[PDB]
Amino acid sequence: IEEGKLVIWINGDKGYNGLAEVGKKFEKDTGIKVTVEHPDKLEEKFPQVAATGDGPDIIFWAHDRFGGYAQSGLLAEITPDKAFQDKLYPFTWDAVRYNGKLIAYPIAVEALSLIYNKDLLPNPPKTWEEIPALDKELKAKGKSALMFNLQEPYFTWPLIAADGGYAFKYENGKYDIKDVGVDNAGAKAGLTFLVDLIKNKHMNADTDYSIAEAAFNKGETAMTINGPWAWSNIDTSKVNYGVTVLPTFKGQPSKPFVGVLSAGINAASPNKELAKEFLENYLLTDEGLEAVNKDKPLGAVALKSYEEELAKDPRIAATMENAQKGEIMPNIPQMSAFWYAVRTAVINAASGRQTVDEALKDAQTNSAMAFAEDKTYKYICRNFSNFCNVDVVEILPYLPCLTARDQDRLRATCTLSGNRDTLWHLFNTLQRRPGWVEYFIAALRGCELVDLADEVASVYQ
Template structure:
């Protein structure tokens, strides 16, 4: 009741002085559902919601140009890793505490947090998981040791015409679950935000994860030459028993007629879970907008509700950011498995300094798996390179 009264007071204030209108910029997949939701909001509160389609790669640069002048969208729908740059430019309004916030996955809320404050309302998660071909793997492995054993058995049985495990081992994004699973991290997460001076990619856990990746190669479980295209093609052709990939690939595997399953990436050890990167999509409010208070109420008291989030999922079926929405779609094992993987994961750092990490870590992994540097040397040098670029 209290929240309803707050919303009513905000709306009355706006209606008293002007006919309010909220403008939302979003990409193609959200347009239709947001238009329908906007019509319902207008019918209920008399506030027009204008939904404008903008190509996803253009939303952030267009917003960076328009928002400082108090123009453009009141709300944008985009990726959590935009937050650092937009907050640094003073363009995002913090989202206050709201009812049912505890129903959202921590990884989604953390992804949109910066400097200890929430700057976005998450609605969809994304993370990689283990995808397996049921023709070769009847029960997915629970631990890395089980995965290694199954992969070796398949390699032997099919003389490597079918590979037991394929994934792009020298691509940091796909190696992260093993590095983070042992305790590595990119930037230290603190109560006031990420500390970009504290880099955990050469700590004991990260090195242990790098040694596991080297073991995969040394024992010929994975091929260092494998890239995403090779992994994807082999699975679609039925020539890979297990891969590590994301929900974006599932439709192609289904269309290829593969009898697949999705499971968590195996634990490093019993109770020591793999931690993939998590990407999050959500709603952000223009801090320069004259309608920002109305925009915040629209998000926290209308969009954030379970039924609205469920309708967003039905229209754009990405991994739900609300736990109770996941309960509503628990009959879809793919969504459940990928969402649980995201729940174990760590949000991709939403600070601009993350741009220096990718190349340094890809190079380090290449040196490690090709025997040109020890894990200790390669990881230490990568961290020094990242720190130098940040400075």
């Protein structure tokens, strides 16, 4: 990472050109060049490159990713004084507080809304259940009722959660990792309804972000589901649109997962004070946020002074109405595994590779497995010295989850670097492999390391 400049990563659906304008003004005042980038998969690349001390100085994503980054030591603790904290809504700071520390700056609150074409549909439906018949009628004039992105579970979550789906149960001050709601009756009813929409040819399983967007902005579909960032493309299309509350399902509100766009500082950045100055004194001002918002709308901003004006816009009131009905996402490290499991479930059920019941059963099983394995791997790392009696060569015969290639590599590592150094690689390789914990417990018992085996079983439970 280069000292004396700032490199920023933000998602390609956000106003990165407006952000670049804030960076130019920063450069004008400070002499520090700001490069804004929107890499593909930046939220997956970040933890890869940052672990090795590279990456951007500043990373923007919704807050659900940041607990995972913070647990890995990838983020600097942010240090706004009390006066600056006072500028932003307390509930937005709560989104970026992880184990008692502020780990990012909150930018804006995002919730999905129903966006509809007033010329095709002056009175949008209050319920999901009326969408099939509306589509049939619209199909008669060469249009459709509703298209939205079916490739990302974020857009389908509001419907899965409506009748009772949830990610993690919050109870007694904490999210319960072992109480997960993706395979209860409410979750199945929501996904079943979506699957039925597809089975009945009211939607297409491969509709994605760009397909849904093009159709809506060209007047071909009467409704879409999207967030505030999509509004400026609709503005330039001259579709006459409204933004309103999501349709209800089974008489209950759709419950979108609410994201706080947040900006974290790379723990490896040599430019932490400059990054703090940029974020506090340039971005989180009326002018900084205006510049970004004018490019792609941010949603309900964290900055009170600016939000007082945005709150007067019906599209923002609708956003916050949908937010009230949904839930702020957890920022916990288990969030990414939850989302991966739900993505697979929705795509498998929509495409017909699995029934809804198969798809959600696997989502529940596979996410619980992920949480438990990640926790065990984290425990092995923090307690490495407990495991330094483990002899890599002795343990390999009991680890059939390792491929022949894994075994040869580990042998070579052992030859070049010794057993202790190889143990780290052993654990790192195991955790990328299916069913590793059971076999690792077995392998420890096979080597007569019963207390160690029991200690692993205990953490994995």
